[PDB]
Design an enzyme around this catalytic site. Structure first.
Site, PDB file in Angstrom:
ATOM      1  N   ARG A   1     -14.045  -1.454 -11.617  1.00 45.31           N
ATOM      2  CA  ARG A   1     -12.700  -1.842 -12.002  1.00 45.31           C
ATOM      3  C   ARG A   1     -11.932  -0.631 -12.494  1.00 45.31           C
ATOM      4  NH1 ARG A   1      -9.329  -6.234 -11.985  1.00 45.31           N
ATOM      5  NH2 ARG A   1      -9.232  -6.473 -14.267  1.00 45.31           N
TER       6      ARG A   1
ATOM      7  N   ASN B   1      -1.925  -4.862  -7.163  1.00 41.31           N
ATOM      8  CA  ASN B   1      -3.091  -5.296  -7.939  1.00 41.31           C
ATOM      9  C   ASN B   1      -3.940  -4.138  -8.465  1.00 41.31           C
ATOM     10  OD1 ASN B   1      -3.136  -8.191  -8.122  1.00 41.31           O
ATOM     11  ND2 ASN B   1      -3.498  -8.260  -5.894  1.00 41.31           N
TER      12      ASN B   1
ATOM     13  N   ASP C   1      -0.247 -17.796  -7.734  1.00 40.90           N
ATOM     14  CA  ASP C   1      -1.347 -18.696  -8.110  1.00 40.90           C
ATOM     15  C   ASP C   1      -0.797 -20.104  -8.342  1.00 40.90           C
ATOM     16  OD1 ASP C   1      -3.569 -16.379  -9.318  1.00 40.90           O
ATOM     17  OD2 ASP C   1      -1.427 -15.909  -9.413  1.00 40.90           O
TER      18      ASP C   1
ATOM     19  N   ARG D   1       0.357 -21.836  -5.061  1.00 37.94           N
ATOM     20  CA  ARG D   1      -0.792 -22.326  -4.317  1.00 37.94           C
ATOM     21  C   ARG D   1      -1.299 -23.614  -4.956  1.00 37.94           C
ATOM     22  NH1 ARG D   1      -3.122 -16.431  -3.967  1.00 37.94           N
ATOM     23  NH2 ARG D   1      -2.720 -15.853  -1.785  1.00 37.94           N
TER      24      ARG D   1
ATOM     25  N   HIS E   1      -3.983 -12.999 -13.766  1.00 36.11           N
ATOM     26  CA  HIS E   1      -3.951 -13.307 -12.343  1.00 36.11           C
ATOM     27  C   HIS E   1      -5.341 -13.179 -11.715  1.00 36.11           C
ATOM     28  CE1 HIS E   1      -2.882 -13.274  -8.106  1.00 36.11           C
ATOM     29  NE2 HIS E   1      -3.433 -12.080  -7.993  1.00 36.11           N
TER      30      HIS E   1
ATOM     31  N   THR F   1      -3.175 -10.585   2.992  1.00 32.82           N
ATOM     32  CA  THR F   1      -2.208 -11.653   2.763  1.00 32.82           C
ATOM     33  C   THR F   1      -0.811 -11.047   2.638  1.00 32.82           C
ATOM     34  OG1 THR F   1      -1.978 -11.991   0.342  1.00 32.82           O
ATOM     35  CG2 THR F   1      -4.077 -12.608   1.362  1.00 32.82           C
TER      36      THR F   1
HETATM   37  N1  LIG Z   1       0.253  -9.995  -7.279  1.00 30.84           N
HETATM   38  C1  LIG Z   1      -0.206 -10.685  -6.113  1.00 30.84           C
HETATM   39  O1  LIG Z   1      -0.283 -11.931  -6.148  1.00 30.84           O
HETATM   40  C2  LIG Z   1      -0.589  -9.968  -4.847  1.00 30.84           C
HETATM   41  C3  LIG Z   1      -0.617  -8.582  -4.799  1.00 30.84           C
HETATM   42  N2  LIG Z   1      -0.934  -7.934  -3.646  1.00 30.84           N
HETATM   43  C4  LIG Z   1      -0.936  -6.468  -3.669  1.00 30.84           C
HETATM   44  O2  LIG Z   1       0.076  -5.818  -2.964  1.00 30.84           O
HETATM   45  C5  LIG Z   1      -0.416  -4.465  -2.722  1.00 30.84           C
HETATM   46  C6  LIG Z   1      -0.191  -4.128  -1.350  1.00 30.84           C
HETATM   47  O3  LIG Z   1      -0.844  -4.876  -0.373  1.00 30.84           O
HETATM   48  P1  LIG Z   1      -0.748  -4.406   1.129  1.00 30.84           P
HETATM   49  O4  LIG Z   1       0.748  -4.301   1.500  1.00 30.84           O
HETATM   50  O5  LIG Z   1      -1.506  -5.376   2.009  1.00 30.84           O
HETATM   51  O6  LIG Z   1      -1.385  -2.934   1.113  1.00 30.84           O
HETATM   52  P2  LIG Z   1      -1.156  -1.820   2.253  1.00 30.84           P
HETATM   53  O7  LIG Z   1      -2.243  -0.782   2.062  1.00 30.84           O
HETATM   54  O8  LIG Z   1      -1.141  -2.391   3.658  1.00 30.84           O
HETATM   55  O9  LIG Z   1       0.226  -1.141   1.920  1.00 30.84           O
HETATM   56  C7  LIG Z   1       0.433  -0.375   0.793  1.00 30.84           C
HETATM   57  C8  LIG Z   1       1.433   0.663   0.938  1.00 30.84           C
HETATM   58  O10 LIG Z   1       1.553   1.435  -0.229  1.00 30.84           O
HETATM   59  C9  LIG Z   1       1.842   2.701   0.251  1.00 30.84           C
HETATM   60  N3  LIG Z   1       1.749   3.782  -0.717  1.00 30.84           N
HETATM   61  C10 LIG Z   1       0.624   4.382  -1.151  1.00 30.84           C
HETATM   62  N4  LIG Z   1       0.953   5.366  -2.028  1.00 30.84           N
HETATM   63  C11 LIG Z   1       2.297   5.403  -2.153  1.00 30.84           C
HETATM   64  C12 LIG Z   1       3.221   6.173  -2.885  1.00 30.84           C
HETATM   65  N5  LIG Z   1       2.766   7.235  -3.775  1.00 30.84           N
HETATM   66  N6  LIG Z   1       4.549   5.938  -2.773  1.00 30.84           N
HETATM   67  C13 LIG Z   1       4.985   4.959  -1.951  1.00 30.84           C
HETATM   68  N7  LIG Z   1       4.140   4.202  -1.241  1.00 30.84           N
HETATM   69  C14 LIG Z   1       2.804   4.398  -1.311  1.00 30.84           C
HETATM   70  C15 LIG Z   1       0.929   2.844   1.433  1.00 30.84           C
HETATM   71  O11 LIG Z   1       1.360   3.851   2.281  1.00 30.84           O
HETATM   72  C16 LIG Z   1       0.992   1.576   2.030  1.00 30.84           C
HETATM   73  O12 LIG Z   1       1.920   1.555   3.070  1.00 30.84           O
HETATM   74  C17 LIG Z   1      -1.857  -4.480  -3.027  1.00 30.84           C
HETATM   75  O13 LIG Z   1      -2.078  -3.861  -4.245  1.00 30.84           O
HETATM   76  C18 LIG Z   1      -2.183  -5.916  -3.100  1.00 30.84           C
HETATM   77  O14 LIG Z   1      -3.218  -6.211  -3.922  1.00 30.84           O
HETATM   78  C19 LIG Z   1      -1.235  -8.619  -2.509  1.00 30.84           C
HETATM   79  C20 LIG Z   1      -1.205 -10.030  -2.516  1.00 30.84           C
HETATM   80  C21 LIG Z   1      -0.878 -10.704  -3.704  1.00 30.84           C
HETATM   81  C1  LIG Z   2      -4.847  -3.506   0.838  1.00 24.03           C
HETATM   82  C2  LIG Z   2      -5.207  -4.835   0.172  1.00 24.03           C
HETATM   83  N1  LIG Z   2      -4.137  -5.799   0.455  1.00 24.03           N
HETATM   84  C3  LIG Z   2      -4.186  -7.107  -0.028  1.00 24.03           C
HETATM   85  N2  LIG Z   2      -5.052  -7.442  -0.976  1.00 24.03           N
HETATM   86  C4  LIG Z   2      -5.102  -8.700  -1.421  1.00 24.03           C
HETATM   87  C5  LIG Z   2      -6.046  -9.094  -2.499  1.00 24.03           C
HETATM   88  C6  LIG Z   2      -5.539  -9.891  -3.520  1.00 24.03           C
HETATM   89  C7  LIG Z   2      -6.360 -10.283  -4.570  1.00 24.03           C
HETATM   90  C8  LIG Z   2      -5.807 -11.136  -5.638  1.00 24.03           C
HETATM   91  O1  LIG Z   2      -4.762 -11.730  -5.460  1.00 24.03           O
HETATM   92  O2  LIG Z   2      -6.454 -11.243  -6.814  1.00 24.03           O
HETATM   93  C9  LIG Z   2      -7.697  -9.874  -4.606  1.00 24.03           C
HETATM   94  C10 LIG Z   2      -8.194  -9.075  -3.600  1.00 24.03           C
HETATM   95  C11 LIG Z   2      -7.382  -8.673  -2.551  1.00 24.03           C
HETATM   96 CL1  LIG Z   2      -8.063  -7.670  -1.306  1.00 24.03          CL
HETATM   97  C12 LIG Z   2      -4.226  -9.650  -0.909  1.00 24.03           C
HETATM   98  N3  LIG Z   2      -3.364  -9.319   0.038  1.00 24.03           N
HETATM   99  C13 LIG Z   2      -3.309  -8.074   0.492  1.00 24.03           C
HETATM  100  N4  LIG Z   2      -2.380  -7.730   1.475  1.00 24.03           N
HETATM  101  C14 LIG Z   2      -6.525  -5.322   0.728  1.00 24.03           C
HETATM  102  C15 LIG Z   2      -7.714  -4.906   0.155  1.00 24.03           C
HETATM  103  C16 LIG Z   2      -8.926  -5.346   0.658  1.00 24.03           C
HETATM  104  C17 LIG Z   2      -8.950  -6.206   1.741  1.00 24.03           C
HETATM  105  C18 LIG Z   2      -7.760  -6.619   2.319  1.00 24.03           C
HETATM  106  C19 LIG Z   2      -6.551  -6.180   1.813  1.00 24.03           C
END
Ligand SMILES: NC(=O)C1=CN([C@@H]2O[C@H](COP(=O)(O)OP(=O)(O)OC[C@H]3O[C@@H](n4cnc5c(N)ncnc54)[C@H](O)[C@@H]3O)[C@@H](O)[C@H]2O)C=CC1
Ligand SMILES: C[C@@H](Nc1nc(-c2cc(C(=O)O)ccc2Cl)cnc1N)c1ccccc1
Ligand SMILES: NC(=O)C1=CN([C@@H]2O[C@H](COP(=O)(O)OP(=O)(O)OC[C@H]3O[C@@H](n4cnc5c(N)ncnc54)[C@H](O)[C@@H]3O)[C@@H](O)[C@H]2O)C=CC1
Ligand SMILES: NC(=O)C1=CN([C@@H]2O[C@H](COP(=O)(O)OP(=O)(O)OC[C@H]3O[C@@H](n4cnc5c(N)ncnc54)[C@H](O)[C@@H]3O)[C@@H](O)[C@H]2O)C=CC1
Ligand SMILES: NC(=O)C1=CN([C@@H]2O[C@H](COP(=O)(O)OP(=O)(O)OC[C@H]3O[C@@H](n4cnc5c(N)ncnc54)[C@H](O)[C@@H]3O)[C@@H](O)[C@H]2O)C=CC1
Ligand SMILES: C[C@@H](Nc1nc(-c2cc(C(=O)O)ccc2Cl)cnc1N)c1ccccc1
Ligand SMILES: C[C@@H](Nc1nc(-c2cc(C(=O)O)ccc2Cl)cnc1N)c1ccccc1
Lengths: 331, 331, 331, 331
Positions: free
Chosen positions: D105, D137, D165, D168, D192, D247
């Site tokens: 973590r 996250n 959350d 859903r 979360h 997602t």
């Molecule tokens: N709070 C919530 O309920 C949820 C949060 N998330 C979070 O959203 C985040 C993104 O998910 P994804 O879009 O699937 O990841 P992704 O890896 O596909 O995209 C992330 C982007 O951040 C960019 N990035 C990295 N360093 C950077 C910087 N210094 N400046 C600007 N951009 C930068 C990457 O180039 C990448 O394009 C993750 O942390 C994920 O956990 C996803 C689902 C739900």
């Molecule tokens: C880049 C990150 N993007 C995302 N990560 C999550 C994610 C959310 C939670 C959460 O909501 O607690 C926990 C684990 C993951 Cl992997 C959800 N949507 C995303 N696009 C990711 C990491 C591992 C596998 C797949 C995708």
């Protein structure tokens, strides 16, 4: 040939029934507010208006048509004859007679019956499978009347009931708490008007029971006198009429919200009037507002709200009163 | 100890200045239709209403507030005092004097000038940076009047002008051709009213010029008499008035479309009334409708439309008549 | 009794059917862009998804379902089996291979035709009255194929076509002119691909013809090189593909714009893929984009655009090319 | 002169500071889903995108721009440099590094902290007065990190927290009850993800407490095992990722809902992560979700949900764990 022919090559002449048609009956201030709100929410592919005042009806139709460039409802029609309402999914009734100087409640209601005796059969003839939404007052009695006359099953006859009362209550609640009404939850049920019931136990924000927090909520010992909120709600129509002569906007918006659930088959829950025979010790054919699930076939389900003894008795008294009037009506 | 305090912890109390506020002046049929359309389009985070009739004014405000559950405009206010309008981005004027039967044009315009001398300086006091949209008739002259009294730069004073006339034209065109008005393009320009100009050369569907396909289009030799479409456009207010007693919905919809471009900075093109000195051959300070680019600064640009000799003459004639009147106004 | 039963009294069961069901075949980048656009536009009461990758399919369905609180489409389903698509008003096909960096859409024919041979019969089996909207590339060729396989009348078989090319053209036009693309008008016709044809003669703002204003418009001696704008439209997909690997958002929006005209019966004009036999002396059953009136019956009319000799020759070139490919297909 | 100058006369050459601007940082799957949802809800007059992958960033921007005809957001810009983000009202952070296999973590967080050390100061530099909405996250911790780095007051630093959350949970409740999620109320709060807390006492339809009808709700002896619903909520993210690899859609929609309340100053209540020191025996600087009132100034108020003993201890245990990690971070 014609300019239209030089410009456009036609593949299909065969037109088709409208698939999402809504009719409004009564183009007074309430009818027209429902109409504008429905149009601006894109709920219908065809809107029809009906009334008995012909010039007024045509003028309202034209005024709306002239707005077409800004709307997504490609056909607006109107008329005295009900053939223009053919195949409506939903028919909203706002027509009726305004109570007159010196007139009793029984005579007022009968006059409205006599109007529904002409309106309903015509609606049914042209849209035998529509849902009926009754707005005309007294709404609970008139919803019963339309159900009786139409011979529709209870799910397809719906009264506007306490829908707007509840909206008003949530607006007042919102102002008191500094929170958007959307996030303020509270229900006004029972007979629309003076005898309606504010369900203190269900009033909440974010699931937090206000009555649990403030056990005096709703009573006379209520340090905050929330009772008055229900009071303002019951007296709102009068207050607004005294200021502008009538009410329009809020009812139109509230009816449009009902239409949306119905037309889009959402299955949201709304406080509307429905046949309540068999609940809270009621065994008469009467309609009262309870939270109902609204969708494609009208009221598919209703929520059984837990009421207190005082609250159940009030609905019972309302039911009694309503029935006593209804058994005097001449169809 | 108050219920609100038990339920809610306040992080901060601060600021609170509206970001997207719209004021409507005059809450008659036109003002309120503007208000409801603007609300249902989620254009404003605050709506202010002003009028001199305080009963009516208060009733209209409350009626809209009771519909707050169904809207996304969290604050609605009103009052005779202009302090309620402070910090408006857009102020819409629908107030003015109604013309008496047997009253000279100059006489009426003068009465309106006297009215505007009260309204406009108060608007400017409280929202010195707003755009002004003038709806009151005669709109072209009254837009000149507002520009003169306000001291605003030309871009920030806009007359609704031929905006509704062009929408009506497109509706009629759509009806004749069996096409949605959105896809029928046609422009009515110049002086709003009986002297307006239907620009035949610009009427098209999918960029196909109707005039080209049909060279007699719009002339007396037109076997399809398209000239009657413009005649209907010009007679519309009167026909609707004769039927329902006023007009409201189409004007309200049209105004909301203009507000949309302005509030969202869209830079769409609309036919609205603007200071036309220097163009189309005119040398006096007069407002007439031409297509204008509308956005957050009001009118930032206008389109130079090629007119026929006759079309140019008609605009020039209107400018002459308008200036003949304006030059005798007493400010 | 269960909780649900304590809480809810049912008036009647028996499932009904969706009134406004839309199906998307292929849940790739384009399919999901189409899906979210259609959801956020509130066009459907039921959305069905189909693909051959079963886990990806389930995941996309669930991801959408998780956002239901924020949508107005009460039911979303998926399945490899076409029974999930039964009763669809509109079926959108986005399945199949996409072109890679520098690869012509025409290089996809064999792969995608073979896929359509399985998809189309399945769609027709379960929604024999739907409109088919084809998106997969090359879209004009595949619209012809979908048409031949389905046995539908051609009005009900629509290719997304040049709706997107024209949208791109208008975006580029608006950028040059400083005007919102909604107010910039111009049509790109023919193949959705390298041989598409910009119709210079119809380009205009507010009905003002740019060609009349600027006679060199679109030619090689045009000092402002407006031809480069069309060249940019042609190279658009390739540019986006090189940058991010594929295109999705713009087609998603374009498809949703088309779906809205169809689902709401707007009768708006769009350039979509259809059979142009009988226009411009074309005798073959070739499909490609011309402006069409779209409504609840799909393509009800074609707009006959007046092309210059050079525009018409360019359009016939595109047709020759496309028919050369279409004619060799084996069913 | 140019075609532009022949066509258009200019009144003034702008240009205003951005008025309703939103920035999305990170154009991965989540970033672009936020973007498209925001574009389709008309929340901004200007949208800015930032990422570190330049080709990808440019391509996404272009794709969106090509859909401009179908949108009402007239300006879309992107760049690696934060100057494109100047004067944003709302800046949404979705950037971050995905967790590596067999990584603690602490080390994952510390990797995101290294990213934020660069992002946040750049954001603050160009929009010193914006609201920050943190999506990356682990969201509760990274919201703390953005808060500490930015130096903003707590009202302007918001984590999406349990918003998704809760959506859903309400989708799942709606499925069980045959009711639209909008009418199914229930709150998931605290940390979360794995340790979130379902507030059983708040779950209701139409103000009717499920816990009161069904005392066993969410307990081990619950015959209907309603706990499994919350278990589904926690497992949802993993299940979707397992199926489609990530997602996007649902989070995208949930974020646009928050942006809506913020941009429109609605003052609705959302379950979002906020600095909770001073509550439930929490004495450390940690962010946890409770129902917050969102408006133009971010979180202005929060609702004090009455929690049971176990509910309280669950939050406290999360706060201890979170601070345990935070107190080890190198800024
Ligand atoms: N709070 C919530 O309920 C949820 C949060 N998330 C979070 O959203 C985040 C993104 O998910 P994804 O879009 O699937 O990841 P992704 O890896 O596909 O995209 C992330 C982007 O951040 C960019 N990035 C990295 N360093 C950077 C910087 N210094 N400046 C600007 N951009 C930068 C990457 O180039 C990448 O394009 C993750 O942390 C994920 O956990 C996803 C689902 C739900
Ligand atoms: C880049 C990150 N993007 C995302 N990560 C999550 C994610 C959310 C939670 C959460 O909501 O607690 C926990 C684990 C993951 Cl992997 C959800 N949507 C995303 N696009 C990711 C990491 C591992 C596998 C797949 C995708
Ligand atoms: N349920 C609720 O919460 C509310 C209900 N209302 C009700 O709405 C009703 C109407 O409101 P207003 O528009 O202000 O009254 P209105 O008198 O201004 O308009 C009524 C229309 O009914 C028409 N009409 C009468 N008989 C007809 C017939 N046989 N066929 C067709 N049309 C006929 C009239 O011509 C008139 O245009 C009232 O009964 C009022 O109580 C108003 C507010 C709230
Ligand atoms: N430009 C266009 O295309 C159209 C313009 N209109 C114009 O809209 C105007 C108003 O229409 P209606 O609402 O039907 O008239 P109305 O008289 O019913 O409404 C006008 C309101 O202005 C108020 N008012 C009068 N003096 C005022 C003052 N000094 N300050 C504040 N408020 C004041 C009145 O109290 C009244 O409520 C008319 O001039 C009409 O011609 C109408 C249709 C089309
Ligand atoms: N008409 C237009 O303007 C545009 C058309 N396209 C076209 O749309 C198509 C899709 O592109 P993307 O979505 O980016 O590709 P993608 O690779 O992201 O997704 C394609 C999906 O089709 C599915 N599929 C393949 N065979 C199938 C079958 N027999 N039945 C059901 N599903 C099947 C795949 O499993 C895959 O999920 C391509 O042909 C592309 O060229 C793309 C952009 C614009
Ligand atoms: C025609 C009727 N129209 C309306 N009537 C009501 C109304 C509603 C209730 C109610 O909601 O219980 C009770 C009495 C009246 Cl009068 C509300 N809005 C109206 N436009 C009316 C009657 C008297 C005075 C003014 C108007
Ligand atoms: C107060 C004014 N209200 C309106 N007036 C008009 C109107 C517009 C034009 C026009 O736009 O050219 C010309 C004359 C009139 Cl009367 C349109 N809609 C209105 N609610 C009115 C005057 C006389 C009769 C009825 C109403």
């Amino acid at each position: 040939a014609t300019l239209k022919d030089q410009l456009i090559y036609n593949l299909l002449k065969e037109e088709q029934t409208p698939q999402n048609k809504i009719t409004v009956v009564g183009v007074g201030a309430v009818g027209m507010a429902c109409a504008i709100s429905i149009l601006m929410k894109d709920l219908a592919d065809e809107l029809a208006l009906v009334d008995v005042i012909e010039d007024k009806l045509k003028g309202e139709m034209m005024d709306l048509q002239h707005g077409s460039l800004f709307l997504r409802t490609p056909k607006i029609v109107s008329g005295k004859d009900y053939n223009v309402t053919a195949n409506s999914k939903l028919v909203i009734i706002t027509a009726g007679a305004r109570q007159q100087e010196g007139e009793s409640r029984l005579n007022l209601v009968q006059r409205n019956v006599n109007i529904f005796k002409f309106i309903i059969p015509n609606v049914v003839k042209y849209s035998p499978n529509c849902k009926l939404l009754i707005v005309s007052n007294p709404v609970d009695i008139l919803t019963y009347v339309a159900w009786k006359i139409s011979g529709f099953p209870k799910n397809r006859v719906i009264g506007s009931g306490c829908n707007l009362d509840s909206a008003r209550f949530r607006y007042l609640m919102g102002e008191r708490l500094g929170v958007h009404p959307l996030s303020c939850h509270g229900w006004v049920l029972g007979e629309h008007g003076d005898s309606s019931v504010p369900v203190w136990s269900g009033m909440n924000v974010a699931g937090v029971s206000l009555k649990t927090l403030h056990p005096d909520l709703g009573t006379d010992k209520d340090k905050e006198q929330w009772k008055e909120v229900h009071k303002q709600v019951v007296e709102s129509a009068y207050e607004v009429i005294k200021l502008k002569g009538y009410t329009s906007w809020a009812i139109g918006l509230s009816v449009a919200d009902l239409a949306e659930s119905i037309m889009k088959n959402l299955r949201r829950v709304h406080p509307v009037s429905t046949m309540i025979k068999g609940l809270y010790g009621i065994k008469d054919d009467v309609f009262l507002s309870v939270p109902c699930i609204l969708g494609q076939n009208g009221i598919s389900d209703l929520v059984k709200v837990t009421l207190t003894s005082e609250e159940e008795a009030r609905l019972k008294k309302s039911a009694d009163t309503l029935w006593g009037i209804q058994k005097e009506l001449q169809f």
